[PDB]
Amino acid sequence: EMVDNLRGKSGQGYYVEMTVGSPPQTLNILVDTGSSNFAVGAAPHPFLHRYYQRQLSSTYRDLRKGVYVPYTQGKWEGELGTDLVSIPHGPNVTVRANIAAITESDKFFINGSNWEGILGLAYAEIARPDDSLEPFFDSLVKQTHVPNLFSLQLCGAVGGSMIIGGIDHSLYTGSLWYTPIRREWYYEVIIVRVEINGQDLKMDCKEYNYDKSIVDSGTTNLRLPKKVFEAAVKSIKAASSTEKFPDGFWLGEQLVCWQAGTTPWNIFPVISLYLMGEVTNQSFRITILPQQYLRPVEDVATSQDDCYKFAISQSSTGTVMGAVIMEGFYVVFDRARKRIGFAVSACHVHDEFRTAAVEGPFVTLDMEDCGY
């Protein structure tokens, strides 16, 4: 009953239906492994189809604590409380959880995204206003018998599955390979090697994780530290040199379009991210095809052709393996065993020549520790 419980628009996140309060109020909620608050629209906003009405819920309790979150791309503010929360196409339970009722915001809600709040699935360390505010998943596990694990299968064109409490074997093929969760704050991981069409970027591996690397379903792009980003764009450019693209394309701002069905996938290279394995100096790789890192835009006005944005961008806050990386993998957030599994998803990307893959093991004898 949990399969196919996600929806989404390209570049706008994936969301799950939830209810809040009594009687239940239905909301679509963005599934966000890069944050740790359950935060929902709770006042009118031009971009909100609907919002949480606390006065209509007889089970609401105000915690009499406010919360204000300025972040890079926007800001939001509201009031903390608790109320009854359920996931209709998730586990068959209702729990009491913290809820941040969003009363003011700037560039937080997205016009036409079809979601009205965010379900932060990461750990208390990064909850706002501080780490004493217990995140949703922690309340779910505490109050029920649900195992301390969830998995995400995000699919491109959008839709997918969030399975809570276990692994659905129908959602992947081949082996599940695990990388340690380095620290329970973000879902922090370690990248030990990067190749672009099999060619090693040859950087000290600490560079790949300056200053952290995270798995974040609430960021669209693959985001890379400046030095890594510059190196990767240079290699992608060298491989795709039979065609030259506007400057703005590489800055992730500008569309490139081809006539229907003629996208030259074969001129774009595959990116290999090798992730730390569960045993010393062993790793596995996930391979990323241009079908993932050239994100298709779905706008009626541009629909005659196939148009894309370059979904790799420069970061000053570390590597972010965002939704375009997660797409086509089945990703297991095995909180109980402090690890994240990757497998090829049933909706994995492929063409006649190449397929997204998860492969291992690889051993590297002369390895420093790759973490910051």
Ligand SMILES: COc1ccc([C@@]2(c3cccc(-c4cccnc4)c3)C[C@@H](OC)C(N)=N2)cc1
């Ligand atoms: C608790 O405060 C926040 C602040 C920002 C976020 C976002 C967030 C906020 C609003 C919208 C999105 C979003 C937008 C487009 C596509 N996907 C997600 C993300 C930012 C992003 O990390 C940089 C992330 N993982 N979640 C979540 C909770």
